[PDB]
Design a protein around this nucleic acid. Structure first.
Ligand SMILES: [Mg+2]
Ligand SMILES: [Mg+2]
Ligand SMILES: [Mg+2]
Ligand SMILES: [Mg+2]
Ligand SMILES: [Mg+2]
Ligand SMILES: [Mg+2]
Ligand SMILES: [Mg+2]
Ligand SMILES: [Mg+2]
Ligand SMILES: [Mg+2]
Ligand SMILES: [Mg+2]
Ligand SMILES: [Mg+2]
Ligand SMILES: [Mg+2]
Ligand SMILES: [Mg+2]
Ligand SMILES: [Mg+2]
Ligand SMILES: [Mg+2]
Ligand SMILES: [Mg+2]
Ligand SMILES: [Mg+2]
Ligand SMILES: [Mg+2]
Ligand SMILES: [Mg+2]
Ligand SMILES: [Mg+2]
Ligand SMILES: [Mg+2]
Ligand SMILES: [Mg+2]
Ligand SMILES: [Mg+2]
Ligand SMILES: [Mg+2]
Ligand SMILES: [Mg+2]
Ligand SMILES: [Mg+2]
Ligand SMILES: [Mg+2]
Lengths: 129, 88, 70, 104, 271, 66
RNA sequence: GGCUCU
RNA sequence: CAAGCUUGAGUCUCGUAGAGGGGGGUAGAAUUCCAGGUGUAGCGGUGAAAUGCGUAGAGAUCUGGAGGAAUACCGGUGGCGAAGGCGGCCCCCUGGACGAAGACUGACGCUCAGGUGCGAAAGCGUGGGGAGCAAACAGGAUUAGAUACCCUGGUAGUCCACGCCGUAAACGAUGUCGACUUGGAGGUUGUGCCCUUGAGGCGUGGCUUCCGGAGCUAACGCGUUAAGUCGACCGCCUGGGGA
């Protein structure tokens, strides 16, 4: 069954990049929106857009640099079978700081670097590199 | 299978709208009718294992539907099993 | 294969027609098929190899029709 | 109810008794609140192969809308009648009424 | 229903009952009873003619219609009863005119069914009609050999006779033994198999269960003296001789049929 | 090329003998669908109708049994 | 037709 | 925890396909047996032979009868089923799938230790049945031998009912459920539309076969029905023997 939408989101991104797809659509959510907000801000996708009213469809415009893909690697960390929570000291550095770790905190979803500057940790959603 | 008139007789008996056809009591009573109709079939045909699989599917579906009704509203569950003569 | 010799018909003609009709209806190969018992494993195996021979030979004939040899 | 197609094959020496059988079977159906849709005597007809050491038979086609109980009675009547040689009942989805291509 | 008994005692260890719950749990119909005095296998000379017979439970005789002459008149089946005189269950039937009779119970017969004898009878299990009126290939029982004499064939619990042919005055039968026999085509027969087919599935378990049935013990012949039996004698277990009767007749294989009167009625013997 | 697809019949009648004789061989065998080009739905209906006409002695089971 | 070992 | 929503799941309506199952009937061809007619010296079998059947009249042929079992052609990398597996025709009872439009319920779902159920053939038990085939066995050959392959026979068994066994290279040697990811040629089964201006033209669903791209893989190869990219749960592995 569809037990996990966030890994479905990441997988549709990953396969879109490998297929050289321009845009990727999926059923929207409040969290999938907050993550695409982060991925646009950090520069991995160009733009996101949610359309529709009763069942909204989130469309992501992917980003390609020099022909090849921007998102080299994207991985799910916390899963329904195994949740991962970290403190602010034990936040990870993806690719020695080059990649990011999308973290859900009490003050919303942010990157790991802003979580450290905020002085608070949370749930590690994904490693994006 | 179950006949069309018996279906509509159940739907109009236990449906709030006589057209809902998908309510929980409607699906339960339609299952209970086909099960009790097939008690005579499998009493005569005990080697129809392939049909018994469809029967056990009906039983398991009725049990899941009942358990949803139980935790959704108990009084409808009590009124239902009282009307259908169900042990559980 | 009930064959009546027609009026003013040569015998080698009617005999060749009778061999023709027996080869058409497939009698000799039927008896050769029924002289011994063949298991349903062997029957499913012979039918699968018959389909693969039909098919790889259809694609090989069509692939060699296109390209040249010298 | 359940639309049936009944065809039976009579001993040709009992060709005279055919309308007595047909009238009894029809009064069985309508007495059982059945309908009768088509009814085609085909007469004596040369068999494709000799049944019961004989070469001809009298055919009767019948399209019927009856309950299945009187049809099982009719089958037992065909079973114990020695006049009827073969009987074939074939269930049909609907009532057919057009004449057969061989009554023609 | 066969019922294996639990081994609370030896003698119940191997007992299989045959329980039929439809039988009447009461006294039989009194007008149809008569006295059946035991014999002991002894003739008018008092000598034992047939051995091993003696004792057993007292048994009243049930008058059974085998001739089956109430023609045209339908009869409903009142109840099924036990008959100790025979292996098959019997049925108490009630005619319309008020006459009650006992018949042999067929297989599928139950209380409340209608039977009817005669030529104009239908063909269902229970009816009795002549085999020139019975279709070829059917299973009948209680078959007459002579017309009006009464049924003599296929009276035991699970038996039946197939009708394989008919040539005018005769029908050819396939007896339960495998013998093919000619019978006149005017002899009555009763449709269906006889009832208690699982009778042979019983196990008596113990010796007393045979003594209840009047079967005295059988002494095998080599356990005797030579004056008593041909097999008798020996210093140890010795049997150097061919198996015979007590009267010196070969048993293993030797035929004993000597009726040249009925050989024309026998199509093929049993095999 | 299929006649039943062209004529558009919902069910083949076993009683149409001149058709079924245009689809059986001389020895009463059922002509395969490779040759006549019959769609396999109608080929199944045709075999199911021929077996009925054989039961009714409208068609032979073979040419010899005579 | 079958016709072992090294 | 409370209230929901409809996309998941399910119910309803009308249809379609199907060797899906159980039960009961029935037909035709052939085999053998039995009786009989004509007929007369071989038959049958093999690499070659012999055992075997035959003048007591076989084999061949014709007529009639019995009985059992399986259902040529259709027939097809065709179909159905959870798997095992399912093949004449008809009826009764019966399960599931799919499609079209709508309507309804509103997360009711996925997986599953233990458990329960089904589960080829062989085998067991009781009761029947018993044509053909055929372990065993017997005889003949072959051979150095031949407890074998070959031949002539032939019993359990194969068949039916009810119970038991609970295994197979029970294999796709690939657990179930769900999501995404370039294509091509087909098969089958629905369905919409275009003037069907012909059997055509354009689509849209289900199932299925072959090739093959990226990618994967030790390689072989898989390749939208994944052995690709991911998620949920279960089962299992840890050197070869011994086992
Ligand atoms: Mg349904
Ligand atoms: Mg004695
Ligand atoms: Mg004794
Ligand atoms: Mg003794
Ligand atoms: Mg002594
Ligand atoms: Mg002496
Ligand atoms: Mg001694
Ligand atoms: Mg001695
Ligand atoms: Mg060597
Ligand atoms: Mg050596
Ligand atoms: Mg809606
Ligand atoms: Mg609503
Ligand atoms: Mg499961
Ligand atoms: Mg388990
Ligand atoms: Mg077996
Ligand atoms: Mg057995
Ligand atoms: Mg047995
Ligand atoms: Mg035998
Ligand atoms: Mg052999
Ligand atoms: Mg295993
Ligand atoms: Mg298998
Ligand atoms: Mg396999
Ligand atoms: Mg495995
Ligand atoms: Mg490939
Ligand atoms: Mg991998
Ligand atoms: Mg996979
Ligand atoms: Mg692998």
């Amino acid at each position: 069954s569809m037990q996990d939408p966030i890994a479905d989101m990441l997988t549709r991104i990953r396969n879109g990049q490998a297929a050289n797809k321009a845009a990727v659509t999926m059923p929207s959510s409040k969290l999938k929106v907050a993550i695409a907000n982060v991925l646009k801000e950090e520069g991995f996708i160009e733009d996101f857009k949610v359309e529709g009213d009763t069942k909204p469809e989130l469309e992501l415009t992917l980003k390609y640099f020099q022909g090849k893909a921007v998102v080299e690697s994207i991985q799910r960390v916390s899963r329904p079978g195994l949740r991962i929570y970290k403190r602010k000291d034990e936040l990870p550095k993806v690719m020695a700081g080059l990649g990011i770790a999308v973290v859900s905190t009490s003050k919303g979803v942010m990157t790991d670097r802003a979580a450290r500057q905020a002085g608070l940790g949370g749930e590690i959603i994904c490693y994006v590199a | 299978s179950l006949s069309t008139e018996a279906t509509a007789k159940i739907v109009s008996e236990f449906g709030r709208d006589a057209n809902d056809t998908g309510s929980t009591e409607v699906q339960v009573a339609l299952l209970t009718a086909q099960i009790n109709h097939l008690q005579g079939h499998f009493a005569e045909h005990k080697k129809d294992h392939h049909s018994r699989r469809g029967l056990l599917r009906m039983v398991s579906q009725r049990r899941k539907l009942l358990d949803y009704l139980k935790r959704k509203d108990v009084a409808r569950y009590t009124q239902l099993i009282e009307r259908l003569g169900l042990r559980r | 294969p009930v064959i009546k010799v027609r009026e003013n018909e040569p015998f080698d003609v009617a005999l060749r027609r009778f061999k023709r009709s027996c080869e058409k209806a497939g009698v000799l190969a039927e008896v050769r098929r029924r002289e011994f018992y063949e298991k349903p494993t062997t029957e499913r195996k012979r039918a699968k190899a018959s389909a693969v021979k039909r098919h790889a030979k259809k694609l090989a004939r069509e692939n060699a029709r296109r390209t040249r040899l010298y | 109810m359940r639309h049936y197609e009944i065809v039976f094959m009579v001993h040709p020496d009992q060709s005279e008794q055919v309308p007595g059988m047909i009238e009894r079977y029809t009064a069985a159906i309508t007495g059982a609140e059945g309908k009768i849709h088509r009814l085609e005597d085909w007469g004596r007809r040369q068999l494709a192969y000799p049944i019961n050491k004989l070469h001809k038979a009298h055919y009767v086609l019948m399209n019927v809308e009856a309950p299945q109980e009187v049809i099982d009675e009719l089958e037992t009547t065909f079973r114990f009648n020695d006049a009827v040689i073969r009987s074939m009942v074939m269930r049909t989805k609907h009532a057919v009424t057009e004449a057969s291509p061989m009554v023609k | 229903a066969v019922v294996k008994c639990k081994p609370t005692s030896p003698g119940r260890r191997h007992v299989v009952k045959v329980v039929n719950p439809e039988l009447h749990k009461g006294k039989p119909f009194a007008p149809l009873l008569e006295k059946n005095s035991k014999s002991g296998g002894r003739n008018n000379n008092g000598r034992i003619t047939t051995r091993h017979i003696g004792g057993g439970h007292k048994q009243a005789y049930r008058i059974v219609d085998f001739k089956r002459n109430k023609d045209g008149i339908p009869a409903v089946v009142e109840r099924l009863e036990y008959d100790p005189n025979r292996s098959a269950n019997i049925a108490l039937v009630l005619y319309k005119d008020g006459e009650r009779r006992y018949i042999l119970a067929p297989k599928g017969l139950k209380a409340g069914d209608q039977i009817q004898s005669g030529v104009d009878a239908a063909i269902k299990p229970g009816n009795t009609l002549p085999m020139r009126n019975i279709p070829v290939g059917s299973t009948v029982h209680n078959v007459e050999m002579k017309p009006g004499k009464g049924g003599q064939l296929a009276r035991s619990a699970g038996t039946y006779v197939q009708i394989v042919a008919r040539d005018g005055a005769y029908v050819t039968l396939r007896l339960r033994s495998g013998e093919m026999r000619k019978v006149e085509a005017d002899c009555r027969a009763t449709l269906g198999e006889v009832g208690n087919a699982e009778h042979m599935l019983r196990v008596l378990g113990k010796a007393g269960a045979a003594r209840w049935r009047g079967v005295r013990p059988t002494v095998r012949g080599t356990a005797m003296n030579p004056v008593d039996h041909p097999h008798g004698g020996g210093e140890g277990r010795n049997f150097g001789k061919h198996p015979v009767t007590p009267w010196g007749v070969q048993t293993k294989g030797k035929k004993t049929r000597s009726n040249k009167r009925t050989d024309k009625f026998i199509v093929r013997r049993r095999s | 090329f299929c006649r039943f697809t062209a004529e558009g019949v919902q069910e083949i009648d076993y009683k149409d003998i001149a058709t079924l004789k245009n689809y059986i061989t001389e020895s009463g065998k059922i002509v395969p669908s490779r040759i006549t080009g019959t769609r396999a739905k109608y080929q199944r209906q045709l075999a199911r109708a021929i077996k009925r006409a054989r039961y009714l002695s409208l068609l032979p089971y073979t040419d010899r049994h005579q």
